[PDB]
Design a protein around this ligand. Sequence first.
Ligand SMILES: *[C@@H]1O[C@H](CO)[C@@H](O)[C@H](O)[C@H]1NC(C)=O
Lengths: 113, 107, 117, 126, 155
Amino acid sequence: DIVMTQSPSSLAMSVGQKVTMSCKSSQSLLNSSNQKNYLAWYQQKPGQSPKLLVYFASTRESGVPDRFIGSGSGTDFTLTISSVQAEDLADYFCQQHYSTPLTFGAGTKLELK
Amino acid sequence: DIQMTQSPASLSASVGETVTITCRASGNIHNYLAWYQQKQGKSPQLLVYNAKTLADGVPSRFSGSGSGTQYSLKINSLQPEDFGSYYCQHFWSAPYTFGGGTNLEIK
Amino acid sequence: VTLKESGPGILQPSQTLSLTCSFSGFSLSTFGMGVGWIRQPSGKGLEWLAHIWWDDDKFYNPALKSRLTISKDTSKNQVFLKIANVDTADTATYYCARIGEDYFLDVWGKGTTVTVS
Amino acid sequence: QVQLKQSGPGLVQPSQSLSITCTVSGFSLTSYGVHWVRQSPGKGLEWLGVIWSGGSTDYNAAFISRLSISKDNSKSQVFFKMNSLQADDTAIYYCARAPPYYDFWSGYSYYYYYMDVWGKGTTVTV
Amino acid sequence: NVTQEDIIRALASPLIKDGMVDEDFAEKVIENESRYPSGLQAKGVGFAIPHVLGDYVRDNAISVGILDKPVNFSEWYQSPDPVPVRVVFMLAIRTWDDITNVMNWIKDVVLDEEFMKRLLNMSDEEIYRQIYTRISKAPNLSGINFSREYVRHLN
Ligand SMILES: *[C@@H]1O[C@H](CO)[C@@H](O)[C@H](O)[C@H]1NC(C)=O
């Protein structure tokens, strides 16, 4: 299999500032240019949305405007859209693309307090 | 169309002179023109393989150049037995239309 | 290597013309070489009539108004250059020539003489 | 207007097999893909083997050490159904759509292996 | 003055003439061109694969158009950027297995620039000979039609 790991276990959030998270794996880069990854947004109840990010670009659907795209190298990462209101959802789960097993990683979640 | 033309229609030179013959296409050749020489009363003998390449061991005196729609055959110095009729053909559209041809005379 | 030709001498305008090629060591079992025919009216330049590639296909000079129909055999590499109607302008030497690889007319024959009366 | 609806049994003990049917409406089964993923509260999410639903083409088995026997992934023109004989774990239930086109520079397969629109899911217990 | 319009039809013409496709093949190809990034330029010399993967096909064929003056097509991966294409490979393929087999052959055609180079300065006969030879030597793609009428150095 291919190792997948996240750096944070959870992050505190408040309305203001930006929320930073990162994702590592054995390798997501392609030789014929490009890079394949995707970070998923999960509402606590339906958990239905990897659709907000395709590769390293805003998704085909409306998604969320001004979504930030992070590093294009071996280690991927993302920031929330500066200060966000959202709610305490598992806004990101990092998944492998370009791999037959398509292993999934753990989520991060936001925490208000 | 693909009509080929050639000039001068008739030219003459003494032995030892340099001779240039111009062959032109209405279309685009992409370096597929080849020249050959006809002796009076005999079939032509292949002279070059392409505008830039020697064919079948003929004398190095025969060479040529060109691009696009403008090609020419050049002889650095005429020797005995090189006089006669010169023709050019292109490997582009299947109807490999001939140029008008030139008669290089002894004078 | 060696190419010879055969055909009629004096024809009437209403007759069909038939001209053939004869080769020795030339083989038509490979894509590399085709065969074609060149016409030369006396005192004029050369005119391309038609050719057949190793892949059995057929190309004609459109200036001949589709009067030329050509079949090609494998026995004796016969190419017939059949012309349905021979006019009084068609007074020329007819040559058979190899196309060769690329566009190298390496093998030419001696040519036949076609006239009218 | 375009939905994936899932239905199947819960409270399934090891003596009974698990069979879940995902009815697809608005995402034709001759164009779009359908993927399945397991989501337990205690391990993270995991990929299940899928058949591309744009035509029953080239079943890609996943996790051979985790592969069940006689996993058919049957595809009809109306619905897709998954089955597993053991039913020895929980939360095997998400159905999702995959992009209907080719991954031209892929290094192993020409499908994208990407999930787009997820269904509602089911509740699976032992 | 070269654009995308009538390139698809220009390359479809020998297929409808031969009868390898059903009626207006070119329009169905254009519909896929409208919805998808068929370009896949991926190189300084733009490459394209306009195609249809449905029915409306009587048998499988490859039709290769050559364009001396580029016409941009939408790029893959990130569709908003158009990229100019010089060589267009139209594919009429059924049963799916042949679309993968054809793309793998095409990948073995675009890669190794020595073949990709000089493609714009070869006659219809030389292009036919080279493509025919590379198809016949492939381990697969047997049965797919290719002929002189399917090669257009211009248009
Ligand atoms: C093709 O792309 C180039 C580079 O962006 C651009 O300058 C050109 O206008 C494009 N072609 C057309 C027809 O717009």
